[PDB]
Amino acid sequence: MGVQVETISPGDGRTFPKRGQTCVVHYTGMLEDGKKFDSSRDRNKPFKFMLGKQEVIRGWEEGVAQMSVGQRAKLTISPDYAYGATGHPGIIPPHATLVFDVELLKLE
């Protein structure tokens, strides 16, 4: 499958990321079983990426683009939109569906 976006808390419902803008997010990354493997909240530093530059997994590029500024959403991402058959050695297993808790804090 692709990316499913479930709202946790609404944003402004009007400001959506456009290609080339920098998205500033807090995120927690979990395997489908619930195990956390990455979180910007545990580092207390928001994560920044530029949309459309493929600095993040495809699921983020298509999922975050569906979020409005200030929204918190749950992204469920199939492995083809994620780390695929290879996974990531010792962090993400092969063919892993990933769940992300993402808050879009602002655009730059």
- Which residue out of 47, 81, 92, 100 is catalytically annotated? 100
CATH of the domain at 10: 3.10.50.40
- The total of structural domains in the chain comes to 1
Q: Is 57 designated active site? A: yes
| Assigned token pair, 13 | 């419902």
Query: Could you tell me if 93 and 35 are in contact, meaning their C-beta atoms sit under 8 angstroms apart?
Result: no
**Residue 75 lies in domain:** 2-108
Query: What does the alpha-carbon distance between residue 68 and residue 4 come to, in Å, rounded to a whole number?
Result: 15
Query: Could you tell me if 78 and 57 are in contact, meaning their C-beta atoms sit under 8 angstroms apart?
Result: no
Burial 44-82 (b: 16+ CB within 10 A, else e): eeebebebeeeebbbbbbbbbbebbbebbbbbbbbbebb
Q: What technique was this entry resolved by?
A: X-ray
Cited resolution, angstroms = 2.0
Query: Could you tell me if 108 and 22 are in contact, meaning their C-beta atoms sit under 8 angstroms apart?
Result: yes
SS3 state of residue 79 = helix
Query: Could you tell me if 4 and 97 are in contact, meaning their C-beta atoms sit under 8 angstroms apart?
Result: no
- Return the closest-CA partner of residue 52 out of 67, 64, 39, 40: 64
Query: What does the alpha-carbon distance between residue 39 and residue 19 come to, in Å, rounded to a whole number?
Result: 24
- Residue length of the chain: 108
Query: What does the alpha-carbon distance between residue 99 and residue 103 come to, in Å, rounded to a whole number?
Result: 13
Q: Is 83 designated active site? A: yes
Q: Is 16 designated active site? A: no
The gap between the terminal CA atoms of the chain, to the nearest Å, is 30
Q: Is 27 designated active site? A: yes
